[PDB]
Write an enzyme that holds these catalytic residues in place. Structure first.
Site, short mmCIF file in Angstrom:
data_model
loop_
_atom_site.label_atom_id
_atom_site.label_comp_id
_atom_site.label_asym_id
_atom_site.label_seq_id
_atom_site.Cartn_x
_atom_site.Cartn_y
_atom_site.Cartn_z
CG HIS A 1 12.92 101.05 33.41
ND1 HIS A 1 13.34 100.83 34.65
CD2 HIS A 1 11.69 101.79 33.65
CE1 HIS A 1 12.62 101.53 35.55
NE2 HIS A 1 11.47 102.02 34.81
CG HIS B 1 8.61 102.96 36.36
ND1 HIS B 1 9.53 103.64 35.64
CD2 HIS B 1 7.58 103.90 36.68
CE1 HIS B 1 9.19 104.89 35.51
NE2 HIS B 1 7.93 105.30 36.02
NE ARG C 1 4.66 113.40 29.64
CZ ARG C 1 5.68 112.85 29.06
NH1 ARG C 1 6.30 112.22 29.77
NH2 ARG C 1 6.10 113.84 27.88
N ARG C 2 4.26 114.70 34.27
CA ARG C 2 4.55 116.10 34.72
C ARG C 2 4.77 117.08 33.38
CB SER D 1 13.95 104.59 35.33
OG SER D 1 14.77 104.25 36.65
CB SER E 1 8.81 107.69 33.19
OG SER E 1 7.66 108.72 33.02
#
Ligand code: 8M4
Ligand code: 8M4
Length: 191
Positions: free
Chosen positions: A131, A43, A139-140, A113, A111
């Site tokens: 993005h 990010h 990480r989940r 966003s 991920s």
């Protein structure tokens, strides 16, 4: 240029809180994404390495394919994959494709966003997503990112993505003119 493919965690990147993980159903009304979004590292907006080539709701989540196009990124990562003991340490010995193996283990999380869910319901004013990031932490969900030289090979690594889903993803990937994408802004941290 490399392709990346994978299922995303959907994250709002909050200022005050440490992190918010959205349920995918909170954003599937704004899918698919068929316009390029920056792909960054963790990010960070000054670390653009490429551009998304589609985000699609499939049966087992939200799948992203993307192009890693930054010359400084690919040249640096390629040099490290062939010469850096540190980069190769967490990877199996003597991989045939060291660059792909290194990205796969060091940047395993994708991920997406998104704006805050309070905005997601509803009628947002502007774009819902900012993005996609390649991530080393946070990480989940299950599954990790796959990197490769051919998009069909990348997507076909995912056994949970069906043949019909893969053909739909690959149609969008093929319709994207890679040449027309601006150069991402990644700068080699050695410079
Ligand atoms: C392509 O090579 C690189 C090298 C370093 C960075 N970022 C960075 C910056 C700076 C700086 O500014 O001072 C310091 C450390 C950096 N990176 C990390 O600590 C790190 C941790 C986990 C994953 C990665 C991604 C990278 C790992 C190597 C294989 C290619 C993917 N990077 C980004 C890309
Ligand atoms: C910010 O300045 C720098 C300095 C060195 C590098 N990387 C690098 C370079 C060269 C070179 O040139 O030959 C060789 C190996 C390098 N690094 C890696 O292979 C690697 C892989 C995964 C994560 C990291 C983060 C690294 C940064 C902080 C110290 C601890 C771990 N690095 C990247 C950025």
């Amino acid at each position: 240029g490399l392709y990346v493919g994978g299922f995303v965690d959907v994250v709002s990147c909050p200022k005050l809180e440490q992190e918010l993980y959205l349920d995918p159903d909170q954003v599937t009304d704004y899918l698919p994404v068929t316009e390029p979004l920056p792909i960054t590292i963790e990010h960070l907006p000054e670390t653009e390495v490429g551009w998304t080539l589609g985000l699609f709701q499939v049966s087992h989540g939200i799948f992203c394919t993307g192009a890693i196009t930054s010359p400084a990124f690919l040249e640096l990562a390629s040099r490290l994959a062939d010469t850096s003991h540190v980069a190769r340490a967490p990877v199996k010995n003597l991989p045939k494709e060291p660059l792909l193996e290194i990205l796969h283990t060091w940047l395993p999380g994708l991920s997406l966003s998104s704006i805050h869910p309070r905005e997601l319901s509803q009628t947002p004013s502007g774009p819902v997503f900012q993005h996609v990031s390649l991530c080393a932490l946070g990480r989940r969900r299950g599954t990790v990112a796959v990197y490769g030289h051919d998009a069909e090979w990348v997507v076909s690594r995912f056994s949970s993505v069906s043949k019909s889903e893969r053909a739909h993803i690959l149609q969008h990937v093929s319709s994207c003119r890679l040449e027309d994408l601006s150069t991402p802004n990644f700068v080699s941290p050695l410079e």
